[PDB]
Design a binder for these strands. Sequence first.
DNA 1: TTGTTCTCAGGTACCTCAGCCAGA
DNA 2: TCTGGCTGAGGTACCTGAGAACAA
Length: 298
Amino acid sequence: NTKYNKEFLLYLAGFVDGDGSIIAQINPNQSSKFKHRLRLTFYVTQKTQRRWFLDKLVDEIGVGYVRDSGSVSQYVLSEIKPLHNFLTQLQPFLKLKQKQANLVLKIIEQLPSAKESPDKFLEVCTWVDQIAALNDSKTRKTTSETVRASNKEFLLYLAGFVDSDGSIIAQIKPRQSNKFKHQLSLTFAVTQKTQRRWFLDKLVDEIGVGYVYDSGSVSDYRLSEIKPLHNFLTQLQPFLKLKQKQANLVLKIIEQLPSAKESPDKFLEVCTWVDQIAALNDSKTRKTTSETVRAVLD
DNA sequence: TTGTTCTCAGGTACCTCAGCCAGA
DNA sequence: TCTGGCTGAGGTACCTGAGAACAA
Ligand SMILES: [Ca+2]
Ligand SMILES: [Ca+2]
């Protein structure tokens, strides 16, 4: 049994709450004693361009594997002993997926019994149900019914959730009344299905600043005020693993706003910093760029 | 002339299942 | 009959922009 470092577990619990998945399944199976086979899996998905991150996990956790699916990759752990050992250690730090974790640990321990009785098996399948109910389940076929046949601790965890479900954005917004016809915009955002808004609300309390906004079926925590933002990113930046470049770039920009609102040179140079931030992001619908701002030649 | 609030939306990058096979 | 490595995809729940309007 490997013991995992607490700091590793804090960050990881956040990223897992963000991009991870804790899953239990009943596999239709003729060979199986009860025509069904239970699978338990922990997943971390990420764009293949960042599979190094998932490759790190394999090394740090020390078990599991990484697979590709064209554009997107996954870390996967289904081996039972190690899975229980890992989840046992991770669950105290989970906030969104903690109930799932614990249910998967219960199932794992009750296994030996489940396989030696039709009735014990059934009960266990009703835990798989529960887990699926907790997840954003949408394509599940085989169900049990079928079978009837401390500030550093918060910043480490918050870095994790931010590296996964969050976004550090910098924008150049076209505007007539602006001295150089464009307005700089910096934003820290965290996104979440509106049914977990209570979580983005918690952030407003813990961070001290910002607001939660709703739209369609999702909500955002957003932070755009130049001061608070600089304060926050200065604190949070040491603990980021995917978005550290973006965080610094935003701090470097904020520090050079003074001299940027003075000369068309500094302004256009700071615009290239915005370009770099979007390059680093998974940018897809960006319109106004620095080259655009180079119409300032007019 | 600037900062900020508040909502919307394109295009995925996730999540959460589905399943087959070889080995012991 | 059991376990773990490996593969495919449905349908969002995110990310990362956009811009109109309020408040200075
Ligand atoms: Ca998520
Ligand atoms: Ca992500």
